[PDB]
C-alpha cells in the first residue's frame, strides 16, 4: 500500500525538515543527489532526495535504509539519517571526496600492492555482510567509494538480500550483468558467493580497466558468462602467481570451491597489500581527470 509505505517510512525517519541540520547544498546528480554540510558536526554529506510519487519500487528503499541502519561497518559508506517531508524522502550518507573505484581504474594504473589493499577492504565488508546473512548482489567498481586518504567503502544497498538458514538461496536477477556470477543465470539458487565472483570481476577491472565483455550488449555478455565460465585475462603472465591464484579462487565456476569472504581474507595475495594511503595519488589523479 502507498499509505502503508509512507507510514512505515514515517516510523523510520527522523522528524522535521532537514534544511535545518544541513547547509551548502550543491547538486551533483539527477532521485537528486547533493553534497552539503552538517551545520552541527561540520561533516560533509551526500544527500539523495526522492519524490516518492515517482519512485516505482519503494519497498526496496525501506529495505535499503533498514539494512544500512543495522549493518554499520568501517568498510560500508556510513548512513547518517533520513527525513520525510510530505512525499519527499531524504537519505543522508557520509560523503567520500575521492570518487569511486571506477574513476581510479579508468584513469590510472594500479599496482598489485594497491589492488591487494582494495580487495582486502572489500572482503572485510563482504565477510561482515555475509556473516550477517546479507548479500549485496550488485558489487562493481561504481559501488566502491574512496576517501582522499585511500579509505575503501562499499555502497548501494538498493539490491541486497537478507537470507536465513531455511531460505539460504535467492533466485532474483538484480545484479549488473557484466559482474554477475554465472550460476545466477544457469540455476535458480545462488548464495553469498555471487558477491565473491563480482569482486573477482572488479579485480579484472583493476588490472585491465574494464570487466570482461564490456563492449558487448548486456544480454550477450550474460550468455557469454554463462557459457564461457571463468573469464580469461589478456596477459596473465604479467601477474604474480599469488594474484593469479587469488583470481582463480574468486572466479571458480564451482560455487563450493570458490572462496568464501572469510577464507579469502586469509589469502596470501592480501599480504602484499600496500598501506591504503598509497592510493592517494591515483585518487587525486582520477579526480582531476574526471572533474568535467
Curated annotation (Swiss-Prot):
A biological process from GO: chromatin remodeling
Annotated ATP binding sites: 28-33, 48, 94-96
UniProt GO MF annotations: ATP binding; collagen binding; gamma-tubulin binding; identical protein binding; protein kinase activity; protein kinase binding; protein serine kinase activity; protein serine/threonine kinase activity
Catalytic activity entry: L-seryl-[protein] + ATP = O-phospho-L-seryl-[protein] + ADP + H(+); L-threonyl-[protein] + ATP = O-phospho-L-threonyl-[protein] + ADP + H(+)
Entry keyword annotation includes Metal-binding: no
Active-site residues, as the UniProt record annotates them: 138
Top-level division of the source organism's lineage: Eukaryota
Keywords: Acetylation, Allosteric enzyme, Apoptosis, ATP-binding, Cell junction, Cell membrane, Cell projection, Chromosome, Cytoplasm, Cytoskeleton, Disease variant, Epilepsy, Exocytosis, Intellectual disability, Kinase, Membrane, Nucleotide-binding, Nucleus, Phosphoprotein, Serine/threonine-protein kinase, Transferase
Phosphothreonine: residues bearing it: 172
Cofactor list: Mg(2+)
Residues with the Phosphotyrosine modification: 34
Gene Ontology CC, one term: ruffle membrane
Location(s), subcellular: Cytoplasm; Cell junction, Focal adhesion; Cell projection, Lamellipodium; Cell membrane
Regulation: Activated by binding small G proteins. Binding of GTP-bound CDC42 or RAC1 to the autoregulatory region releases monomers from the autoinhibited dimer, and enables activation by phosphorylation of Thr-172.
Record note on what altering residue 178 to C does: In IDDMSSD; gain-of-function; enhanced PAK1 kinase activity and significantly reduced homodimerization
Domain (Protein kinase): residue spans on this chain: 22-270
PTM annotation: Autophosphorylated in trans, meaning that in a dimer, one kinase molecule phosphorylates the other one. Activated by autophosphorylation at Thr-172 in response to a conformation change, triggered by interaction with GTP-bound CDC42 or RAC1. Activated by phosphorylation at Thr-172 by BRSK2 and by PDPK1. Phosphorylated by JAK2 in response to PRL; this increases PAK1 kinase activity.
Subunit structure: Homodimer; homodimerization results in autoinhibition. Active as monomer. Interacts with GIT1. Component of cytoplasmic complexes, which also contains PXN, ARHGEF7 and GIT1. Interacts with NISCH. Interacts with DVL1; mediates the formation of a DVL1, MUSK and PAK1 ternary complex involved in AChR clustering. Binds to the caspase-cleaved p110 isoform of CDC2L1 and CDC2L2, p110C, but not the full-length proteins. Interacts with ARHGEF7. Interacts tightly with GTP-bound but not GDP-bound CDC42/P21 and RAC1. Interacts with SCRIB. Interacts with PDPK1. Interacts (via kinase domain) with RAF1.
Family: Belongs to the protein kinase superfamily. STE Ser/Thr protein kinase family. STE20 subfamily.
Functional summary from the UniProt entry: Protein kinase involved in intracellular signaling pathways downstream of integrins and receptor-type kinases that plays an important role in cytoskeleton dynamics, in cell adhesion, migration, proliferation, apoptosis, mitosis, and in vesicle-mediated transport processes. Can directly phosphorylate BAD and protects cells against apoptosis. Activated by interaction with CDC42 and RAC1. Functions as a GTPase effector that links the Rho-related GTPases CDC42 and RAC1 to the JNK MAP kinase pathway. Phosphorylates and activates MAP2K1, and thereby mediates activation of downstream MAP kinases.
Disease: Intellectual developmental disorder with macrocephaly, seizures, and speech delay: An autosomal dominant neurodevelopmental disorder characterized by impaired intellectual development, poor speech, postnatal macrocephaly, and seizures.
Protein name (Swiss-Prot/TrEMBL): Serine/threonine-protein kinase PAK 1
Lineage: Eukaryota, Metazoa, Chordata, Craniata, Vertebrata
Residues of the full protein shown: 249 to 543 of 545
Amino acid at each position: 500500500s502507498d499509505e502503508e509505505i509512507l507510514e512505515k517510512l514515517r516510523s523510520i525517519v527522523s522528524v522535521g525538515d532537514p534544511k535545518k541540520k544541513y547547509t551548502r547544498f550543491e547538486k551533483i546528480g539527477q532521485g537528486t543527489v547533493y553534497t552539503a554540510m552538517d551545520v552541527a558536526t561540520g561533516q560533509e554529506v551526500a544527500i539523495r532526495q526522492m519524490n516518492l510519487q515517482q519512485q516505482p519500487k519503494k519497498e526496496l528503499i525501506i529495505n535499503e535504509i533498514l539494512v544500512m541502519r543495522e549493518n554499520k561497518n568501517p568498510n560500508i559508506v556510513n548512513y547518517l539519517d533520513s527525513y520525510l517531508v510530505g512525499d519527499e524522502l531524504w537519505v543522508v550518507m557520509e560523503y567520500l571526496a575521492g570518487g569511486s573505484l571506477t574513476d581510479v581504474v579508468t584513469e590510472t594504473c594500479m599496482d598489485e600492492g594497491q589492488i591487494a589493499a582494495v580487495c582486502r577492504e572489500c572482503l572485510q565488508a563482504l565477510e561482515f555482510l555475509h556473516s550477517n546473512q546479507v548479500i549485496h548482489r550488485d558489487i562493481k567498481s561504481d559501488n566502491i567509494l574512496l576517501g582522499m586518504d585511500g579509505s575503501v567503502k562499499l555502497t548501494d544497498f538498493g539490491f541486497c538480500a537478507q537470507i536465513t538458514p531455511e531460505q539460504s538461496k535467492r533466485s532474483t536477477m538484480v545484479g549488473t550483468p557484466y559482474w554477475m556470477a554465472p550460476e545466477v543465470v544457469t540455476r535458480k539458487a545462488y548464495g553469498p558467493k555471487v558477491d565473491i565472483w563480482s569482486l573477482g570481476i572488479m579485480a579484472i577491472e583493476m588490472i585491465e580497466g574494464e570487466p570482461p565483455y564490456l563492449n558487448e550488449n548486456p544480454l550477450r555478455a550474460l550468455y557469454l558468462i554463462a557459457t564461457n565460465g571463468t573469464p580469461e585475462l589478456q596477459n596473465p603472465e604479467k601477474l604474480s602467481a599469488i594474484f593469479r591464484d587469488f583470481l582463480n579462487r574468486c572466479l571458480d565456476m564451482d560455487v563450493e570451491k570458490r572462496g568464501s569472504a572469510k577464507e579469502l581474507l586469509q589469502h596470501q595475495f592480501l599480504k602484499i597489500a600496500k598501506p591504503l594511503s598509497s592510493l592517494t595519488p591515483l585518487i587525486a589523479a582520477a579526480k582531476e581527470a574526471t572533474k568535467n
